């Protein structure tokens, strides 16, 4: 028995990706960014992913590796094999710069030069195609598959003229064909003469950017339930001669018994059912009523919590990210971990082409897979956004540790040119004139009076930052630290402060043995800093629910959640949301 599934249908927020599995082995195609988030919400059976097949060197195709290697490291999968362009493995020697030279997992890379494979089923054949190089994969069970990627119009003529597909067209039998091509090039005129020759008995699956659907379900559920409390700070999310069907979430297929689709576990959203389920929790409705009665008691500088999790994400909190915007047309992103662009898109919708046009700089605290992975996704999409608005490309300033430049240089030299979108400021120069003038540009582009940095605790070369505006409001971002005096010394009297509750109280021994902070320690550090408001972020990977309360939870403390919005005028009412939230996650 063998099936097939569509992990991602190719929406704007997530690239295309396919998942094949049987009794013996399991496979994966185009492991793009955010793929590891999926396959865990849906509870798909990993633990046997011997092979990964990649159709291009672009980031949207190869972005999910760094997380999938670690996921396989968990559960101890002995080996994995990559297949794709010859430029692989040089991408991989670049990942080891920041991912740490892990030796528990041994892996191999197969270039396009290997034609046969032939291992225990389905006998992958690799088919290189040039325009500048893509590889198409066709598989033959001991039925047949076809998986093709056609990013541009220039690939149509090579694709339709290849001789490899001609011994399966007409009469072999190719059960399916999967296309991942933009809607613009899907029709052409030379095209549709190639997918025709397979005969109408075959069905074609397409994963264009027009594949509108929701791949998460649970995030939307929790967000609507939260919006039940107070809508302003919890906005709702937003998303031929032969037969042809458009791709959806997972879906399903069968090849041997009969070639039939199956909607066994498609995902659907039912806001009203979510609301009625929510209203049955113990004392949730009463708490919301009390809060609404209590509510009877500027908006420009605001912060959006795109991500608040730690370690590999777990379907409720994504890897840490936080957007700070000083005006409707000037912004700043802070940490840029994995999945940032997906969160931004699923938060704003069609305004992303304008929000990306306001970014002025980014700030990565340190080099961990949860803090800098998603930057190239922001850069590439910012390029397109600038193109759509009819303005030239202006490099996006980035403040980062000096060790980040090595990974970017390796990627630039080995996979694709991405370095020309970036202007780098070494974070060391912003703590206690070529880079000085770039610093002046950073300060002037946001009207910030000063930008400050400090070497915080945790691993080597980890930093925090403080931002102070000409209007006088001051916000300090800690990053990952254990209670240290670098904060406070960085400048007290901050209007807002963000700190990490990576652990619950009573685990100070773990907070000492490993460099992370408990909630009580975080609140203590914030109160010593004498900040007007204290905000908790970067939560523990164990629970992902509301934290544990302690006596020191003063009026100045708050609990951050994913996709949440905040303004300086919301502080007097923010502490009053605790009861209904605690009733929600009972
Ligand atoms: Zn780290
Ligand atoms: Zn961290």
Swiss-Prot record:
Q: What is the enzyme's main class?
A: hydrolase
* GO biological process: one example: mitochondrial tRNA 3'-end processing
**Expression across tissues:** Widely expressed. Highly expressed in heart, placenta, liver, skeletal muscle, kidney, pancreas, testis and ovary. Weakly expressed in brain, lung, spleen, thymus, prostate, small intestine, colon and leukocytes.
Location comes to: Mitochondrion; Mitochondrion matrix, Mitochondrion nucleoid; Nucleus
Give residues where Phosphoserine occurs. 550
Q: Does the keyword 4Fe-4S apply?
A: no
- EC number(s) recorded for this UniProt protein: 3.1.26.11
- Pfam families from the UniProt entry: Lactamase_B_2, Lactamase_B_4
| Keyword terms of this UniProt record | Disease variant, Endonuclease, Hydrolase, Metal-binding, Mitochondrion, Mitochondrion nucleoid, Nuclease, Nucleus, Phosphoprotein, Primary mitochondrial disease, Proto-oncogene, Transit peptide, tRNA processing, Zinc
Q: Which reaction does it catalyse?
A: Endonucleolytic cleavage of RNA, removing extra 3' nucleotides from tRNA precursor, generating 3' termini of tRNAs. A 3'-hydroxy group is left at the tRNA terminus and a 5'-phosphoryl group is left at the trailer molecule
Q: Which family does it belong to?
A: Belongs to the RNase Z family.
This protein is called Zinc phosphodiesterase ELAC protein 2
> Taxonomically, what lineage is the organism?
Eukaryota, Metazoa, Chordata, Craniata, Vertebrata
């Amino acid at each position: 028995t063998v099936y097939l599934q569509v992990v991602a249908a190719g929406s704007r927020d997530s690239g295309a990706a396919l998942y094949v599995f049987s009794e013996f082995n399991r496979y994966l195609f185009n492991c793009g960014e955010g793929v590891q988030r999926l396959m865990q919400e849906h509870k798909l059976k990993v633990a046997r992913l011997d092979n990964i097949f990649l159709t291009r060197m672009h980031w949207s195709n190869v972005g999910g590796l760094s997380g999938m290697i670690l996921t396989l490291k968990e559960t101890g999968l002995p080996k994995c094999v990559l297949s794709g362009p010859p430029q692989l493995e040089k991408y991989l020697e670049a990942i080891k710069i920041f991912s740490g030279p892990l030796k528990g997992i041994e892996l191999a890379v197969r270039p396009h030069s290997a034609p046969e494979y032939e291992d225990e089923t389905m006998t992958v054949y690799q088919i290189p195609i040039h325009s500048s190089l893509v590889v198409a994969f066709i598989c033959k069970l001991h039925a047949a598959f076809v998986v093709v990627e056609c990013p541009d119009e220039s690939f149509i003529q090579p694709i339709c003229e290849n001789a490899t597909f001609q011994r399966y067209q007409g009469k072999a039998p190719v059960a399916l064909v999967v296309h991942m091509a933009p809607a613009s090039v899907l029709v052409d005129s030379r095209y549709q003469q190639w997918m025709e020759r397979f005969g109408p008995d075959t069905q074609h699956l397409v994963l264009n950017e027009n594949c509108a659907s929701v791949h998460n379900l649970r995030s939307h559920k929790i967000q609507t339930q939260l919006n039940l409390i107070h809508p302003d700070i919890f906005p709702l999310l937003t998303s031929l001669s032969v037969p042809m069907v458009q791709g959806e979430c997972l879906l399903k297929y069968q090849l041997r018994p009969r070639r039939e689709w199956q909607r066994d576990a498609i995902i659907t959203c039912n806001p009203e059912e979510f609301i009625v389920e929510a209203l049955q929790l113990p004392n949730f409705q009463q708490s919301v009523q009390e809060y609404r009665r209590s509510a009877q008691d500027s908006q420009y500088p605001e912060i959006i919590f795109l991500g608040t999790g730690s370690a590999i994400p777990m379907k409720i909190r994504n890897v840490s990210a936080t957007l700070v915007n000083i005006s409707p047309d000037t912004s700043l992103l802070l940490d840029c971990g994995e999945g940032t662009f997906g969160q931004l898109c699923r938060h704003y919708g069609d305004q992303v082409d304008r929000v990306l046009g306001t970014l002025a700089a980014v700030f990565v605290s340190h080099l961990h897979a949860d803090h800098h992975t998603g930057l190239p996704s922001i850069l590439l999409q910012r390029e397109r956004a600038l193109a759509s608005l009819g303005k030239p490309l202006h490099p996006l300033l980035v403040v980062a540790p000096n060790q980040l430049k090595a990974w970017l240089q390796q990627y630039h030299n080995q996979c694709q040119e991405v370095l020309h979108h970036i202007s780098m400021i070494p974070a060391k120069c912003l703590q206690e004139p070529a880079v000085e003038r770039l610093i002046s540009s950073l300060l002037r582009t946001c009207d910030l009076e000063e930008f400050q940095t400090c070497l915080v605790r945790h691993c080597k070369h980890a930093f925090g930052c403080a931002l102070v505006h000409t209007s006088g409001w001051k916000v300090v971002y800690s990053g990952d630290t254990m209670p240290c005096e670098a904060l406070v010394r960085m400048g007290k009297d901050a209007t807002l402060l963000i700190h990490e509750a990576t652990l619950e109280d009573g685990l100070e021994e773990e907070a000492v043995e490993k460099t992370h902070s408990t909630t009580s320690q975080a609140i203590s550090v914030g109160m010593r800093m004498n900040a007007e408001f204290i905000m908790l972020n970067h939560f523990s990977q164990r629970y992902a629910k509301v934290p544990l309360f302690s006596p020191n939870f003063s009026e100045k403390v708050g609990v951050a959640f994913d996709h949440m919005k905040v303004c300086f005028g919301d502080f007097p009412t923010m502490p009053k949301l605790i009861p209904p939230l605690k009733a929600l996650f009972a």
